[PDB]
Protein: Mitogen-activated protein kinase kinase kinase 14
Organism: Homo sapiens
Amino acid sequence: SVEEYLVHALQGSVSSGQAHSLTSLAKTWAARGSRSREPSPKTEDNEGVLLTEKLKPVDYEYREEVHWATHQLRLGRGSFGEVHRMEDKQTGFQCAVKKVRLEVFRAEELMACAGLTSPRIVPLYGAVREGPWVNIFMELLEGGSLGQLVKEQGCLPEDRALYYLGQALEGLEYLHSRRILHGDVKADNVLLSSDGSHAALCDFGHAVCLLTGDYIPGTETHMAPEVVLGRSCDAKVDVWSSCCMMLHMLNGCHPWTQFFRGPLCLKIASEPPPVREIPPSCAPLTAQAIQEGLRKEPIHRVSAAELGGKVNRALQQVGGLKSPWRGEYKEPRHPP
Ligand SMILES: COc1cc(C(=O)NC2CCOCC2)ccc1Nc1nccc(-c2cnc3c(c2)[C@@](C)(CO)CN3)n1
């Protein structure tokens, strides 16, 4: 009766509003893309909610080509849609737009980040639907992804690795305390500011709003053992995946991939945690932090807050962030 009337009032219109309005409407989109395809009307449905004065609807409409447009080439591929730079034609403000087909759209894409006030989570500017297309609007982060920095740099020095992992665990701590599982923590889903000083989580395509059995695992190399074994999953899956991302930043390669072929699910269930992939040259507190994040039993695995403390303390132990922003190529680990 509360959500039922809110969505009835919001449907068929683009409005300026709050997170709860967008979130409520997003659930009806997730359900629509489950239904069988219908014949399209003359004028497409246009509905949704903009959360910033930077993106202004015009007579309750916000349509691509008319009110805003993408310019230049794509920022990349998210789990469920391509991402572009866009500009509101009225206000001139630029942002990022992810374009998701309705039949692959999960409301958790917006529920996980709508109205969250963390510097470690990419701000959501709103989302608008044009018939079978959901446009998700977010703050533009000029530095690109951590995943792209690792490809370009080969791998990162320990202090830079620790610094970004630290900022990611602050993000994960904020989410976990609000019963949100990210579900795809990897370097590709961390974005950097232009000076490389700020990191923020993006792409909540795999998010669940909580223990659960509905978790769609992302990248097989970053999956926690409890996921593979088809067991109950909590926030700890994100802690495991964050330490897989750490191994990736230090080594320049995903864990497992340089030692095993075929589907890795079996190997992740059967093998010891990939603690052997920890560089011998790493500081003791660094190795201890990754070891406690890569415990196979989730109950014994440290929390995002706990790993965050250890990682902050590991960064102090190596002298803090000294390494330069976009330094010289560092050769990734060779296969054996
Ligand atoms: C200038 O800004 C950006 C530049 C670049 C960039 O240089 N790309 C080059 C890299 C080399 O190949 C060609 C393209 C990337 C992101 C930017 N900013 C940005 N800002 C907000 C959100 C998002 C975003 C949201 N959800 C995402 C992603 C990104 C994915 C695709 C990131 O992997 C995954 N899901 N991204």
